[PDB]
Ligand binder design. Structure first.
Ligand SMILES: CC(C)N(CC#Cc1nc2c(N)ncnc2n1[C@@H]1O[C@H](CO)[C@@H](O)[C@H]1O)C[C@H]1O[C@@H](n2cnc3c(N)ncnc32)[C@H](O)[C@@H]1O
Ligand SMILES: CC(C)N(CC#Cc1nc2c(N)ncnc2n1[C@@H]1O[C@H](CO)[C@@H](O)[C@H]1O)C[C@H]1O[C@@H](n2cnc3c(N)ncnc32)[C@H](O)[C@@H]1O
Ligand SMILES: CC(C)N(CC#Cc1nc2c(N)ncnc2n1[C@@H]1O[C@H](CO)[C@@H](O)[C@H]1O)C[C@H]1O[C@@H](n2cnc3c(N)ncnc32)[C@H](O)[C@@H]1O
Ligand SMILES: CC(C)N(CC#Cc1nc2c(N)ncnc2n1[C@@H]1O[C@H](CO)[C@@H](O)[C@H]1O)C[C@H]1O[C@@H](n2cnc3c(N)ncnc32)[C@H](O)[C@@H]1O
Lengths: 258, 258, 258, 258
């Protein structure tokens, strides 16, 4: 089976990568970074996010695995001491997490998939966007920006913005505010909002039409944006899982104790 | 078809109730408060919560409707000006919202269903409960209490505790903290937590074993409690719906503007 | 000089107390728990709060010292390994922290001093109090309760309610909400509020007139309350200080790392 | 007495300005925008902030007044219907609010005064700054940025970041976080922090040394910054006051009702 390994690029991750390639060479495993069926990411969650986006156009053909060469990751949830054990196993069940579809319309159109979140922020100071939910005007937001998170993204930016942590088996997306203005003139809901599949959340400009839009680790200034549309994707990321490591335990282990 | 009408008991709600009974008398509708198939609640959301608990043992045989004789309710989402219009319609589709199952174990066992939420608070000062998720010890909570909310309950106590607002088509429950202590000795997650169906959240005492447990509007001091167990119920509440009034619009109308 | 020592009452604190009494016996120090000039509290901050209230009527005649026989306290900020060193020193400068004056009016009047905070909570469910600031109606609060904190109290209940941490050299008091209801009908400020000396914050009932009022570790159900009035006290608590242990370092040491 | 009038520049504010200049022409008042003793700002709080910075080098020689031609401002707290009444009065007591001193050190040095706040944000994504309080390392902050507010600034950016509202008679500054990361690896205090006069808060880079620093409405990318130092200024802004309009009432009027 074709596999590839991305590395964070520090000495520990590079050497672990080379040692795992050696191990795979002892099985019927072919290294192929063009059409892998298995993508192993060695590093932390940033490395894992890069692996996802490197292969996002072949997501249904790939099972991802993450090895953390520092602290426990939510994606990189395997320790380097089990690298040799993991090679033997690869040569399993699959677990799928929901993804966020982001559409950017100009005046053509571009789509992006997010594993953690997509955000929109101002070209300086506070910006103003109308928030439309299923074609219904919900609020006029004035403030620093907005963050739309996947379930597995809820432990990342979403959490620091006060959002809820959502088990990734729930097919949903969660919208959180960054520093909204609320006075007698300006009003937002304030609370995070959790949307099911097939709900569409549209952000539309009011005066300024330039924004910084991020998708996971990738931030891009978009000019002449007419709309940013969020919906739970029909596409899913698949993990190879070899043991039970429950999400709520990953949460406990990362934020409570370990 | 058998129906009954509960009233808030003020002059406006009582008279509306009597006028609707008169209207129903002009159709093949029988007033029956023992085995109604239709339960109309005239008042506000507190009246609607009482109607739900009055008939909670026959939930699958009943379609509920709420009329608000004050401001818009999330359950009582019909205006008194449409009472006559509603009688004609009753004589429709059904919409179902998830419910919260609460189990209280002593040392027998009692179960309760919640439409908004169930909370646990101390017999004075801060109390200490261990929080166990699917048999896995997640945190030791020290503070004022904990709130487990349904989706439609997320706009109620849950919202004032910083929880996310969740569309009620999502079969989930949401746990929020009330004033947790966090220092070098005590640690909680802080964030609201959203659980899917078939996850079980167990609260267990540490020293003191007496607690105040609420279910919707009903608060009861429970002695010698060993455990409080939360799970999304298999039971659902059914609404009679006659027009589109989207949840996100009810949110906008109650918290943003109207 | 007359001194006394309170103990948490566990084996470690009792023995440390007896060993310090022995040390003081080697100097011109007289043990006197009726009219001490020095009050040493051995335990944690709860013990220190009890010492303060045991001698609150002679506050200007007393310098307090706290020894923590567990983790670092904000009041009990001396380690047991320096007990012998502390005896020699006692036989120094003084540092003073502001206090909170609480007045409870019925229909006579009672005053209390708080070192951490005074709170008001409901006789069940949410309660409703009008909040009047310098005789000006500021808001109608509906929710779980309100907390008025001193500066040194800001790291305690106030912090868990989202309040700011305030250096205790600032003569002020800070008001924080517990779970307020905010919808189209009910409105509060939400933010913590910080008041200088000579500002008076009055809480007044709306319907129910029974409340639970706490002052530091002491919680008391007050019947037929007409008003609870908060102001920065003219009285101050005095600490004996023998070394520099800055407040911001105590904060770092308790909440960040140590 | 020399005065000048700034205008928001819309039709309503320009005409009010011209009408007030006419009124002043009937008294011994000389229009002088180089050395005014009275500075009237007609617009909203943004106009008032611009007036402050236009004359910040002569603050002790000037009494400011703000007229709001839209909704009530915290600085622009006079209605256009009292413009004629205000001219007669000008031809009073003075009220002074504290200011924030910001020092930017490179590798020379630049100082700025803020009426609302000074913030520091990243040249993209999260940035990392060490926070040093009175030469004591307090925390390593990773996240979107930090906001240091004056008392009268607490109702502005500070409030949207969860900070406390502080009466402006308190000589203090308040530090609030923007979206900090908190996991097993990264730790911040989370709570807003309130500092008295003569405390110095230093922000220092860790890797990246470029930042966006704002002072009130003015945002400037600073290259090769070694340190940003915050302290309560010795300088104060002086308002001409002609009637009692208490701060807590301005708060009520802007955020609760009017
Ligand atoms: C390229 C860098 C900037 N990373 C990689 C990652 C990750 C990431 N994934 C997750 C996740 N699923 N669950 C829990 N933690 C996560 N991590 C951690 O996040 C910290 C910062 O990377 C590290 O501990 C990561 O291991 C990008 C992510 O940074 C988040 N981000 C940006 N700005 C933030 C802010 N101000 N506050 C909080 N988060 C912020 C956001 O999700 C963005 O995608
Ligand atoms: C018997 C009384 C006390 N009610 C009836 C109701 C309702 C209720 N349902 C909802 C809902 N689905 N969504 C949005 N709003 C709701 N309302 C409103 O809630 C306010 C207070 O009743 C009123 O405007 C209600 O119309 C009980 C409910 O009170 C909530 N509660 C208790 N203590 C709270 C607090 N401190 N803060 C916020 N909420 C608190 C909680 O949900 C409990 O079930
Ligand atoms: C009798 C008991 C209940 N204690 C003693 C103390 C203290 C106390 N002083 C302080 C302080 N100056 N600064 C920082 N920490 C403090 N501690 C700590 O507080 C924790 C709980 O005692 C322990 O780690 C204490 O060492 C009473 C105090 O309990 C606070 N309290 C009550 N309910 C709370 C809640 N839900 N959340 C957060 N705090 C809550 C409140 O201040 C009350 O006075
Ligand atoms: C040039 C513009 C951007 N203004 C002018 C002003 C003011 C300002 N002063 C105050 C104040 N003393 N107290 C209460 N409100 C204030 N206003 C109001 O603030 C809103 C936005 O201007 C309007 O209603 C103002 O009348 C700059 C100020 O914008 C604040 N700011 C920036 N980004 C923010 C955000 N994300 N959230 C909340 N505030 C944010 C900040 O204080 C900055 O100085």
């Amino acid at each position: 089976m074709k596999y590839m390994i991305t590395s964070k690029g520090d000495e520990k991750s590079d050497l672990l990568r080379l040692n795992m390639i050696a191990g795979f060479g002892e099985y019927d495993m072919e290294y192929d970074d063009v059409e892998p069926e298995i993508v192993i990411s060695i590093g932390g969650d940033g490395t894992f996010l890069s692996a996802f986006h490197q292969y996002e156009e072949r997501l249904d053909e790939i099972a991802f695995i993450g090895i953390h060469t520092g602290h426990l990751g939510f994606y990189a949830d395997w320790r380097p001491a089990e690298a040799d054990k993991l090679v033997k196993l690869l040569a399993y069940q699959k677990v799928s997490y929901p993804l966020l579809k982001t559409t950017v319309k100009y005046g053509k159109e571009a789509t992006y998939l997010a594993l953690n979140e997509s955000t929109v922020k101002s070209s300086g100071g506070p910006f103003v966007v109308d928030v439309v939910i299923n074609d219904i005007h919900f609020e006029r937001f004035r403030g620093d920006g907005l963050c739309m998170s996947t379930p597995s993204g809820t432990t990342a930016y979403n959490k620091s913005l006060g959002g809820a942590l959502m088990h990734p088996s729930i097919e949903a997306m969660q919208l959180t505010e960054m520093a909204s203005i609320n006075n007698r003139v300006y009003r937002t809901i304030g609370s995070p909002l959790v949307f099911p599949k097939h709900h569409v959340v549209s952000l539309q400009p009011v005066n300024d039409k330039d924004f910084q839009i991020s998708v996971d680790h990738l931030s891009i200034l978009h000019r002449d944006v007419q709309e940013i549309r969020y919906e739970v994707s029909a596409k899913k990321i698949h993990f190879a899982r070899f043991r039970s490591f429950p999400f709520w335990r990953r949460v406990h282990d990362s934020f409570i104790e370990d």
